[PDB]
Structure formats: structure tokens, C-alpha cells
């Protein structure tokens, strides 16, 4: 399983979108849920973030979906 942001083996790229959502706020929440977080990048309509293929994330109030595609990034991905 490989990352769409970095090409890394061992990742699934999710997109994240929510009200009053930013990237640091995204990451804090994810860690707040016990998830291990890889590369992140903000995109034109939201955020991309790598989660473990095994991870089954459930943040209250946020919508988290695996990406089919990566489009309209706003920044280069990094950790
Ligand atoms: Cl499942």
C-alpha cells in the first residue's frame, strides 16, 4: 500500500475537510484519536493526510475519506 503524496510504502492518503478546519488542527485531532500520521498537504478544497492502511479513523464532526486522486495541492508535502 503506497502514499499518493510521497509514494511511500505503507500509507493510505486520505482527504480531510471540515468547518473551521486547518492543518495543525487536523493533525492534533488525528493524534487525539490514537492514529499514526504520515505526510500531510493542504489542497484547494481541503487537506490530504496519510493514514495507516490498517487504521480505521472516526473523528466526531470531521469527514475523512481515502483519496482516489490528489488534485489541486497548495503546498509541497512534508512532515
Ligand atoms: Cl472495515
Residue numbers in the entry: 425 to 503
From the study:
To visualize the structure of the C-terminal tail of the Hera_RBD, we crystallized several constructs and mutants of Hera_RBD. Two of the mutants, Hera_RBD_K463A and R444A/R449A, yielded structures with their entire C-terminal sequences visible in the electron density maps up to aa 510. In all structures where the C-terminal part is ordered, residues 493-498 fold back onto the outermost β-strand β2 of the RBD and physically block the RNA-binding site (cyan and orange in Figure 5A), with exception of the wild-type Hera_RBD structure. Although the point mutations are likely responsible for the different crystal forms, they do not per se impose this particular conformation of the C-terminus, and only the far ends of the C-termini extending away from the RBD are dictated by crystal contacts. The C-terminal part of the RBD can therefore adopt at least two major orientations, distended from the RBD or attached to the β2 strand. Mutation of K463 abolishes RNA binding (see previously). For the Hera_K463A/32mer and Hera_1-491/32mer complexes, the Kd values were 1.0 ± 0.17 µM and 1.1 ± 0.13 µM. These values are identical to the Kd value of the Hera_core/32mer complex, demonstrating that the RBD does not contribute to RNA binding in these mutants. Mutants were grouped into three classes according to their Kd values: (i) with no or only a moderate (<5-fold) effect on RNA binding (K439A, R487A and R492A), (ii) with an intermediate (5- to 10-fold) effect on RNA binding (R444A and Y472A) and (iii) mutants that showed a >25-fold increase in the Kd values (R449A, R444/449 A, K463A and ΔC-tail).
The ‘heat-resistant RNA-dependent ATPase’ Hera is a DEAD box protein from Thermus thermophilus. Hera consists of a helicase core, followed by a bipartite C-terminal extension that contains a dimerization domain (DD) and an RNA-binding domain (RBD). The RBD is responsible for binding of Hera to 23S rRNA fragments comprising hairpin 92 and for binding of RNaseP RNA. The Hera RBD forms a modified RNA recognition motif (RRM).
